[PDB]
């Protein structure tokens, strides 16, 4: 029931020979795994933690100047010198001013002038980095037991969370009553934390590209620097003003916090106050359902009366969830649940909370099932007092096919070349598709890095037009496909 | 002389008294008393709702977030009528004086 | 049974506490305190002065 009520649900159906399935886990998403003899499980990536961050650069977003000094030299005497030019905590500039008898000079020319001021940082943004071995993905595996944890906390069940680290990427959950599940994850491929910086700025943290971070035009410290006083690009945070040729001056350029916020658009925000927590990204895992068994398959039908205690509702995914209570004898019984037609001649829908059972009489169990599009009837119980529930599913099968194609394409857009692993059961077609996607995505990312979505749409339109106005059919079709894919990615790029 | 203020821009603000209101799917928009006040910046959006968070339906429930906007620094922009435009000129003859 | 109200619509209103403020030409916009809360319906316009 944890995975219900989340609009980004994914249904992964089927395990291969070996009883394993490849599932990508995303933070905002959730995965419901359906296997034939296995119970239905819900997998959610609820946390990614980076530990032991190391700073590589401390940028200055707000500074001040305190000790301004000037040296002036008469024309043809060369540029002047201040003793504080050697000082790395001072920012200096060389200019020229008009000189002559009026200035106490005696030569009437452009006399070089140098002005220096002490650069002091008042606000900085850290750029901590983390080693890929220090990530820790937390995952919650919850099965469709149809039951609840129960408020009585003296016993706490149904809450198995597994931590996955690059060192320990294989772990098993012990779901009570359902055996155990094995997750064979690959954290080292989910995110390249050697090309990412945990940018923290005034109680707000972002995850950013490392080259982008190193390219920022603000003054920076090495990161091990413990006293400031050696800022590198101090000239980017100051301005030297020589109106006409009378005097030279230097002033600071105000807090760069808002300009940084503008620069950070397109960077995913993370948390860095109580640990470095990243609620973004994906995990590729292999699900080992071999030692996963349905609970209570030795039980018998209830042969009793059920009452609906939570009225049937339709989730955002085309399934229906209902909560029924059993009022009969033989408490540990399988619940007779069918999605038939009006005459009950055909089975039209397949339930999702597979093998719904009653463990205690006074313990409601909520069933999730997938009805067909249109009229359908939910039948619960057996002939005496059997409760028959009607339902109408408003969609269309063609509409569902379109929605699933759209969802698959969107997954490809986000997890490019990793979308081939979301539900893959091995196979040769999946491998060929993934290899082709890797080869094509290498070129696409090379040719489209650092381009805004508007530029992507423009380039897609241009390429589509070029392909349309192409004599060669072999070139025209390829160009049109490239243009349409570019247009799609540009229309669904910013996230 | 005597410039007149034409507009004050805010360059540094702060948000306080943040509040939110939610409504179940298909039941319309949530209401916040602070929406009436213009010192509060507000936005309407949709969140996932369902049995888990107390709704009988499983759609996109509307939500409204309101926070009080307070300005901390200004960028006042003033204007001057050309009449109050004292220019100053210095005329020095080539008298040849020593200084 | 037990329907939930989705929206109220105003078919008969009234106006009270009318206020106005002007600013000299090229000095920007007039400012009214009543413009602060959304109970007051307001509009900006130009009148020669």
């Amino acid at each position: 029931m944890r995975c219900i009520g989340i609009s980004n649900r994914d249904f992964v159906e089927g395990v291969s020979g070996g009883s394993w399935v490849d599932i990508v886990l995303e933070h905002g998403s959730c995965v419901t795994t359906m296997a034939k003899n296995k119970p239905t499980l819900d997998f959610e990536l609820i946390k990614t933690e980076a530990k032991h961050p190391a700073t590589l650069r401390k940028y200055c977003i707000e500074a001040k100047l305190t000790n301004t000094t000037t040296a002036s030299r008469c024309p043809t005497q060369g540029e002047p010198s201040l003793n504080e030019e050697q000082d790395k905590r001072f920012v200096c500039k060389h200019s020229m001013v008009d000189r002559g008898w009026g200035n106490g000079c005696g030569l009437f020319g452009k006399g070089g002038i140098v002005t220096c001021a002490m650069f002091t940082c008042k606000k900085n943004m850290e750029g901590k980095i983390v080693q890929p071995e220090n990530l820790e993905y937390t995952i919650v595996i919850t099965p469709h037991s149809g039951e609840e944890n129960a408020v009585g906390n003296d016993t706490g069940k149904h809450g198995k969370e597994i931590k996955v680290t690059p060192q320990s990427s294989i772990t098993e959950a012990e779901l009570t009553g359902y055996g155990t599940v094995t997750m064979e994850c690959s954290p080292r491929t989910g995110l390249d934390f050697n090309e990412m910086v945990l940018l923290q700025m005034e109680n707000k943290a972002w995850l950013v590209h490392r080259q982008w971070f190193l390219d920022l035009p603000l003054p920076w410290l090495p990161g091990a620097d413990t006293q400031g006083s050696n800022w590198i690009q101090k000239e980017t945070l100051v301005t030297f003003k020589n109106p006409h040729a009378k005097k030279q001056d230097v002033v600071v350029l105000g807090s760069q916090e808002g300009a940084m916020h503008t620069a950070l658009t397109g960077a995913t925000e993370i948390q860095m106050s109580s640990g470095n927590l990243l609620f973004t990204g994906h995990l590729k895992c292999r699900l080992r359902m071999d030692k996963l068994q349905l609970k209570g398959m030795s039980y018998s039908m209830c042969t009793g009366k059920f009452k609906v205690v939570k009225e049937i509702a339709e989730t955002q995914h085309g399934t229906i969830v209902i909560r029924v209570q059993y009022e009969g004898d033989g408490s540990p019984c399988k619940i007779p649940f069918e999605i038939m037609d009006l005459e009950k001649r055909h089975v039209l829908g397949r339930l999702i909370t597979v093998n719904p059972i009653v463990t205690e009489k006074d313990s409601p169990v909520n069933i999730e099932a997938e009805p067909p599009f249109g009229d359908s009837y939910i039948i619960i119980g057996v002939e005496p007092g059997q409760l028959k529930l009607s339902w109408f599913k408003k969609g269309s099968s063609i509409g569902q096919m379109f929605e699933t194609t759209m969802r698959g394409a969107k997954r490809m857009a986000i997890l490019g070349d990793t979308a081939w692993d979301f539900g893959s059961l091995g196979g040769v077609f999946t491998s060929i598709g993934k290899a082709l996607h890797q080869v094509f995505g290498a070129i696409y990312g090379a040719a489209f890095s650092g381009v805004s979505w508007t530029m992507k749409i423009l380039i897609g339109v241009v390429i589509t037009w070029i392909g349309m106005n192409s004599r060669s059919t072999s070139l025209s079709v390829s160009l049109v496909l490239v243009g349409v894919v570019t247009l799609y990615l540009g229309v669904m790029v910013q996230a | 002389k005597h410039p007149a203020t034409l507009r004050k821009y805010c360059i540094e603000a702060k948000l306080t008294n943040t509040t939110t209101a939610s409504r179940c799917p298909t039941q319309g928009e949530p209401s916040l008393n602070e929406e009436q006040d213009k010192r509060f910046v507000c936005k309407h959006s949709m969140v996932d709702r369902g049995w888990g968070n107390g709704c009988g339906l499983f759609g996109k429930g509307g939500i409204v977030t309101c926070a009080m906007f307070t300005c901390k620094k200004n960028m006042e922009g003033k204007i001057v009528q050309p009449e109050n435009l004292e220019y100053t000129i210095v005329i020095t003859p080539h008298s040849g004086e020593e200084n | 049974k037990h329907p939930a109200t989705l929206r109220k619509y105003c078919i008969e209103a009234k106006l009270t506490n009318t206020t106005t403020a002007s600013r000299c030409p090229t000095q920007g916009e007039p400012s009214l305190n009543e413009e602060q809360d959304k109970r007051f319906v307001c509009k900006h316009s130009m009148v020669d002065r």
Epitope: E44, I46, K47, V140, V151, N153, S273, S274, L277, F279, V309, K310 | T19, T20, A21, S22, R23, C24, Q27, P30, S31, L32, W51, G52, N53, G54, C55, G56 | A4, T5
Partner: antibody, heavy 126, light 109 residues
Framework: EVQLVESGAEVKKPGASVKVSCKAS????????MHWVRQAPGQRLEWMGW????????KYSQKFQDRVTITRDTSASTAYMELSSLRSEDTAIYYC?????????????????????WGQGTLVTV | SALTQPASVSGSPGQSITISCTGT?????????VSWFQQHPGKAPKLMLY???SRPSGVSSRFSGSKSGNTASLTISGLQAEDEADYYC??????????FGGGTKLTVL
């Protein structure tokens, strides 16, 4: 066992301030939000506000908003409810009730079984 | 904004007695955050029902909850002497606060 224990009863005079604590044990203190609920002698339960032990966030009732301050001590797994400028109407038992926050650490939507565990109740008189 | 409940209620032992909690479209008419608390004298409130109908693990099955429009109801079927207590209704409102009922005193005699 998940037991919630609050400080002992206290006697204060009108115009003073009182701090009440609620010690949480048997569960991860940071995973749940702490609610303060006061009940005047022989009257209805009244909600005051909650503290999110995970991040120290708080939400107070419009009433009590200006007088009540809620704080937590992650080290001790303890929550505090400071009521300032006590009046004759503030004499009542002050209960603490928990509600789990979501896995993000954000406590905005409660759990259906909010207030499942309560403290014994601290009595304050003015 | 307090949820409205009858001041008092009495039922003969072994009978069934119902309690009402009338609220607004935001507290108990808009959301399923309806909870019933039982408070014996000198003791903290005890969660009797939640999500309208769901009852805690230790809570007897004699306690049943219903909700209709802006009103949520609590019913007791056994009416044992131990059931005589003060019952409070609470709801999580649309603005993010908790409102409590005025409480009903149930007496068996």
């Amino acid at each position: 066992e998940v037991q919630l224990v609050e400080s002992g009863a206290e006697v204060k005079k009108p115009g003073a301030s009182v701090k009440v604590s609620c010690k949480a044990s048997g569960y991860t203190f940071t995973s749940y939000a702490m609610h303060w609920v006061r009940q005047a002698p022989g009257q209805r339960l009244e909600w005051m506000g909650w503290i999110n032990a995970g991040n120290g966030n708080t939400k107070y009732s419009q009433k009590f908003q200006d007088r009540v301050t809620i704080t937590r001590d992650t080290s001790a797994s303890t929550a505090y409810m400071e009521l300032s400028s006590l009046r004759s109407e503030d004499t009542a038992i002050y209960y603490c009730a928990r509600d789990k926050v979501d896995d993000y650490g954000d406590y905005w939507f409660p759990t259906l079984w909010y207030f499942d565990y309560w403290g014994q109740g601290t009595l304050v008189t003015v | 904004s307090a949820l409205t409940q009858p001041a008092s209620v009495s039922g003969s032992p072994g009978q069934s007695i119902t309690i009402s909690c009338t609220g607004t479209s935001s507290d108990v008419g808009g959301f399923n955050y309806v909870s019933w608390f039982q408070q014996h004298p000198g003791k903290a409130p005890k969660l009797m029902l939640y999500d309208v109908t769901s009852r805690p693990s230790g809570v007897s099955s004699r306690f049943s909850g219903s909700k209709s429009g802006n009103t949520a109801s609590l019913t007791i079927s056994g009416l044992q002497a131990e059931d005589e207590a003060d019952y409070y209704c609470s709801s999580h409102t649309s603005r993010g606060t908790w409102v409590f009922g005025g409480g009903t005193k149930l007496t068996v005699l």
